[PDB]
Design a protein around this ligand. Sequence first.
Ligand SMILES: COc1ccccc1-c1ccncc1C(=O)Nc1nnc(OCc2ccc(Cl)cc2)s1
Ligand SMILES: COc1ccccc1-c1ccncc1C(=O)Nc1nnc(OCc2ccc(Cl)cc2)s1
Lengths: 386, 386
Amino acid sequence: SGVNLPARRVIIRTPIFGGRPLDILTYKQMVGRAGRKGVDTVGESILICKNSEKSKGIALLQGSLKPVRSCLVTGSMIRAILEIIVGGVASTSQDMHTYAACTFLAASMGAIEACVMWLLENEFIQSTKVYHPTHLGSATLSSSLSPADTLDIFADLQRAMKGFVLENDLHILYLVTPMFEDWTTIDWYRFFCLWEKLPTSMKRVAELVGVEEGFLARCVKGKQHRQMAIHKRFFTSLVLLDLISEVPLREINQKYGCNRGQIQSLQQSAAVYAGMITVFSNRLGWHNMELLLSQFQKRLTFGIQRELCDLVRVSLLNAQRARVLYASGFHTVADLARANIVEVEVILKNAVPMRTIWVTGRKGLTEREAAALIVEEARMILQQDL
Amino acid sequence: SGVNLPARRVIIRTPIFGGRPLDILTYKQMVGRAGRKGVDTVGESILICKNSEKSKGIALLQGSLKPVRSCLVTGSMIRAILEIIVGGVASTSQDMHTYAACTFLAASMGAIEACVMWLLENEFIQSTKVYHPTHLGSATLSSSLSPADTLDIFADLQRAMKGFVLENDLHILYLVTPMFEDWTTIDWYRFFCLWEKLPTSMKRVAELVGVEEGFLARCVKGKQHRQMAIHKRFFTSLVLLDLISEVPLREINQKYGCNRGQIQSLQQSAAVYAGMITVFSNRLGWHNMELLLSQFQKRLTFGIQRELCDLVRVSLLNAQRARVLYASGFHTVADLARANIVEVEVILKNAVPMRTIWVTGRKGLTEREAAALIVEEARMILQQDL
Ligand SMILES: COc1ccccc1-c1ccncc1C(=O)Nc1nnc(OCc2ccc(Cl)cc2)s1
Ligand SMILES: COc1ccccc1-c1ccncc1C(=O)Nc1nnc(OCc2ccc(Cl)cc2)s1
């Protein structure tokens, strides 16, 4: 389902993918890559099946795509009703049913009343029965979060304001940690070990958010839907703690047991969540929390420290071409606009963990061209932003 | 002792000033204003005395200024020793006594050893006996605070990081509140009344810093050196709360019983203290507290809200020419650089609580000239800062 990568022959080892038969859409997506346009005369797809498996293989061969659905009480319809009401585009319930008469459900061929009742009973919307957005209802639509999740997000942030720990970045990370989902398979023993070795200030954040020690890779070590979601959020917030501490990905993998792809996926998800939480607090008139969260989206997107938050504005300074360029004295995009060209070439030549330097979207770049583009990007950034 | 304000005749009602005889330096300062240069031929000072008072009056007439002193264990010598050691200008104790051989005490004609011992026993300085600044010793010299006060300041900030209240500005104000000193005569009943009417979130900050209700304008209402310094800091932090809430000075005076001169003096002192605390946290590697405190110095210097923190950068927008200029849509020094000249003239003409507008250092300014200078200052600010 990703990038366009055609191959002359596509061999699909087994029709059973992950314990379940291969999806017909997935199978079509795979076999559509068989054959390079303008190079090959034909393209070949070979699905390797056997014995009984032969039946599922022939079903995939002769199958066709399933019809499209709507997926619309439900979270999607709640989101849609909130989106229209809070935007001011629809006010009366007659308009509310008119809107549902414009959806895919109306084209495929009660719920809106239930959605309006749920939004009214949860203080997302006020009734005068003209429906008007509240402050929480406006903040949910602004920070782009599901109204189902926004209730617990509001409760968590409101509890965090009452007591906050400013001597580390872990409390500002537990709030921007999205969830556990399935980003990794948490090892309980490993978690408990890390916990037994946290600073004298972390466990303060751990107990201020809900984590424990009697249930913190303990009971589950030798073997509750919210406490599981807290510890699996604490561990997740510990990993991000090492991501914003510029710990190398291999060290994070060794200490936590999660591979680098999972760590990168988690950091991207956490940066998205941090941006959403920042907007949510900004629209709610929470100035003492939005100010704290305003930098963690960048610090999680690039996995950096605060010092590099100005250097990573350059498109070619991710988290290691900016740290080696920061240690040499360049700590600001201003010092990098006139940064001696050949100098940054030498600095990028040093510290190796022709076009060896790889840039996202630029593929491989030679050291000289890489740092030349770095200084040019710094010049553009500081020149067009004022 | 203030500005140069000469008068033809200076009449000093009584030689007894504030229950004590008038200082000879103060008397000379008063009577030096008798006579305007280039206008009067002579100047007259008349000290009105009587009966016994006549003796103190004639003593003031025939008195002379006392000799200068040095005022240098003592807090001044501790400050001087810390200043030289942490600056790196002096390292060995031989150099430390050489420094004291350069002071006014050496010119007027043990202590340095006691000061070094006090700085060593309080972790301001490390001994290798070459003396080197620590992180706390470097942070004390950076944020310009007395090392005597910096210990309790460090303890208070360190306690605040563990538990902080971000849902109001009162916790960020209790840390930047200098002290009680004598800025006002606190009325206990009034204080207790205000306290009985605080938001459901203030008393959280009050109990997180040390304030109580059993002793909060209670016992002292019907009638301990630290609890007195906390409540007298809580009340002081409440007043500043109304100063940064843009409450009019007369309303603050009515609700708190402190006149406007005392309130302005307190707000200036608190802004100075906020700047010092911000630098102290900046040099200690406290990024989650320096970020919170980075705006309160301005918000206390001008007694404004956050929205006006960009408008008050203009020299002629204190806290009421910026609020009336903010309500009309100008919320940034960018919108005020091209702000229609005649438009801001009309806006300044409105909202009155020829040169009626008074500007600090510009004396009285006509509305047209005032807002013309306002837009010119905005242009200069946004033009020379990038
Ligand atoms: C909550 O918003 C986020 C902020 C940071 C990072 C991720 C998200 C996010 C996360 C999950 N799902 C969605 C979003 C999302 O992008 N929502 C957005 N809403 N507005 C945006 O700006 C676009 C824009 C701005 C101004 C104008 Cl005039 C027109 C368009 S982005
Ligand atoms: C703690 O510093 C404060 C900061 C804000 C407001 C009040 C104070 C304060 C309060 C009580 N006593 C003293 C101060 C004071 O100004 N100390 C200062 N130290 N350095 C400064 O900047 C001058 C400077 C800067 C850079 C160079 Cl290269 C040369 C000189 S000011």
